[PDB]
Write a protein that binds this ligand. Structure first.
Ligand SMILES: CC(=O)SCCNC(=O)CCNC(=O)[C@H](O)C(C)(C)COP(=O)(O)OP(=O)(O)OC[C@H]1O[C@@H](n2cnc3c(N)ncnc32)[C@H](O)[C@@H]1OP(=O)(O)O
Ligand SMILES: CC(=O)SCCNC(=O)CCNC(=O)[C@H](O)C(C)(C)COP(=O)(O)OP(=O)(O)OC[C@H]1O[C@@H](n2cnc3c(N)ncnc32)[C@H](O)[C@@H]1OP(=O)(O)O
Ligand SMILES: CC(=O)SCCNC(=O)CCNC(=O)[C@H](O)C(C)(C)COP(=O)(O)OP(=O)(O)OC[C@H]1O[C@@H](n2cnc3c(N)ncnc32)[C@H](O)[C@@H]1OP(=O)(O)O
Ligand SMILES: [Cl-]
Ligand SMILES: [Cl-]
Ligand code: NA
Lengths: 210, 211, 211
């Protein structure tokens, strides 16, 4: 039964910055898998990096397992976008008679949920824009502004987002996607950790036989 | 009808969102009514204006009904070093080096930052010296504005990239001719439904011009 | 004449601008005289050097007379994860996982960060591992330096883009042959007017004189 307790908020002794995300969550519509961590700058909670997240819009932030999320990473949800049909000025916010110009959901340029897969490495000070989907095993370069979807096992960076490269061949990627090591039982993961780390996919497929 | 533009904190229970105009204390900054800054921590809009020096005499001008996102910063002309030879600012250190004080003519001055009306500036935008941003423009979050921005266009990136024009050229000229932001508030209130949904055709009719 | 390069705070009223070299307490950080960091709040230059681990042994090297803007950060080689398989750093959590501590040969190490002399680094610049920046370069504000920078060039953006060369190739070669930053301070002072106003012809005649 090796490995840390995923219910541990601070799984590293002496370290007051790095947090397992899941057991810190208190707000709704934030769904984060076990072992995924946030390496905070100064002890701030992961939740406070999630911005413009309003119940009435009801968009969700979804993050898988074994993700590495760097310090200062922020998640921009759908509340951040104004109506763009005419004036972008949010008259309704100021009330005093203007509250009747409250936008309907259909009026807003909603983009849907932010969905981050498993085993994703997000660099320092990354900004994630509304509705973005990030595939399994992707790597987001430091200081990136993720303005569009990211394919699984690809490396991207920049502002706006640029494609850097695929981590592996298309065939190897499909093998990792078929395997889904993150969904294996922890006992199986533990026994297979050397191959998960060194990327020996062919070996994992053999252990795959049972 | 509508809020008081002289009220610093026009949203009940909100201590971050400020009407900018009544917070201005400095010369060489002009901001139009109803334009607001949604601060991160309650910092003032003036705290976001950097390298702005009286001796340089550059100005920051912002129109009416602008939306300015958290952490937006305005870089004025004091930020640039002399570039004819070494960029090192010897004069700062005195002890004999003060006689190398630069002339304003020796500096790469870019002029005023001028932002139009009904402009929406995203979170954490950086605006570089001498930039002009036209009416109705939209600046994407985290953008670094390094060149002028055409009216009613959307832009973003570092360096700044053109994303798209919001409307057709003909429509844009209609908005620029209309200038609803300069109308009396009584007339604005009457036309708010169309100002908001962009029914420029109704707005034209409602104006009742010498057609 | 000029300030004492051992003075941490060489400007009288100023609590933010620090000469870097005398503040350095760490190993593997080598910074030349007169190079300064104009801090945001008051932090130290070393606070801006991140993921710098003795076990990696990489070095941050900065020449003389560099101007480093506020919020500039230096990302050392400790910031990169192993990329052969999962990027997840199991070893950090121990409880049995300490066995999987990665070795140096399994890491994507990029080498030392090396910044030349007379380099101007703008506000809020990020410097990635293994980057080399040549003498006299200028790094635009908010840039993310993702690759090497030629001497006497201007670059900016995220990722980094080439803007332009500061001078003609012939002039750049003359500045590089000159290396004024390496001359004795008596000679520096004597030639400060020409170093500052970019009179490279004069500097060249002066150099030929005592060669
Ligand atoms: C959760 C945590 O604990 S996170 C911890 C904190 N650590 C970090 O933030 C570090 C994150 N790491 C990075 O950003 C790294 O630089 C990585 C992942 C991009 C390294 O990728 P590598 O493949 O090793 O980069 P490499 O140096 O080969 O560059 C690859 C290409 O992309 C370009 N590139 C590099 N960085 C960027 C970028 N940020 N944006 C766009 N392109 C970039 C390079 O120029 C190169 O292209 P070229 O060959 O055409 O020039
Ligand atoms: C004052 C206040 O209250 S501010 C409140 C805080 N809110 C904010 O900061 C949010 C501001 N909004 C944004 O930045 C949004 O992303 C907007 C305005 C750019 C949305 O633009 P949309 O028209 O919806 O564009 P959409 O998302 O479809 O993308 C359009 C293009 O822009 C590209 N794009 C998106 N973001 C950027 C960017 N930041 N830089 C460059 N290009 C971008 C997209 O890739 C797409 O290009 P493509 O079709 O070639 O891929
Ligand atoms: C240590 C200290 O004390 S630092 C103090 C803080 N000061 C700073 O941070 C300011 C540093 N200065 C800058 O960033 C300046 O904008 C400079 C040095 C890049 C300007 O260089 P310049 O040659 O003046 O000017 P210029 O303004 O002419 O622009 C030339 C090109 O650069 C482009 N450009 C400007 N900024 C950027 C940028 N940040 N990234 C990429 N391109 C840029 C411009 O668009 C233009 O390109 P184009 O011709 O393709 O349109
Ligand atoms: Cl300032
Ligand atoms: Cl001007
Ligand atoms: Na860019």
């Amino acid at each position: 039964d090796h490995g840390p307790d995923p219910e541990n908020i601070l799984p590293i002794k002496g370290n007051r910055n790095l947090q397992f995300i899941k057991p810190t969550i208190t707000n709704e519509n934030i769904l984060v898998g076990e072992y995924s961590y946030y390496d905070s700058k100064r002890g701030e909670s992961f939740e406070d990096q999630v911005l413009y997240h309003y119940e009435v819009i009801g968009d969700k932030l979804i993050i898988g397992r074994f993700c590495s999320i760097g310090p200062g990473t922020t998640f921009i949800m759908n509340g951040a976008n104004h109506r763009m049909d005419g004036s972008t000025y949010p008259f309704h916010l100021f009330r005093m008679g203007w509250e009747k110009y409250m936008p309907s959901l259909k009026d807003l340029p909603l983009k849907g949920d932010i969905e981050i897969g498993n085993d994703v490495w997000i660099g320092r000070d990354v900004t994630i824009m509304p509705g973005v989907k990030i595939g399994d095993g992707a790597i987001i370069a430091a200081e990136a502004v993720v303005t569009k979807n990211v394919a699984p096992y690809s490396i991207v960076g920049g502002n706006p987002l640029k494609f850097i490269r695929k981590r592996f061949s298309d065939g190897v990627i499909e093998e990792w996607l078929a395997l889904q090591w993150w969904n294996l039982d922890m006992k199986i993961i533990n026994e297979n950790l050397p191959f998960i780390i060194n990327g020996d996919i062919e070996m994992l497929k053999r252990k795959r036989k049972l």
